[PDB]
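Re: that chain you flagged

S.,

Sorry for the slow reply, it's been a week of failed gels. I finally had a moment to sit down with the sequence you sent. For the record, here it is as I used it:
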Amino acid sequence: TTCCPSIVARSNFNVCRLPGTPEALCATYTGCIIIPGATCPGDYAN
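Prediction finished late last night. Pasting the structure tokens below so you have them in one place:
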């Protein structure tokens, strides 16, 4: 899971992901954490 800290950062993450490709670059570019865990930390849950 693509765990983002704010709703804005997740929406920005989804704009990064409009081409439908660079999930890891969407992480670095929007300060989100892609974690092997099936769900998101309390502080990274959008």
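What I noticed first: The chain has one domain: 1-46.

Talk soon,
D.
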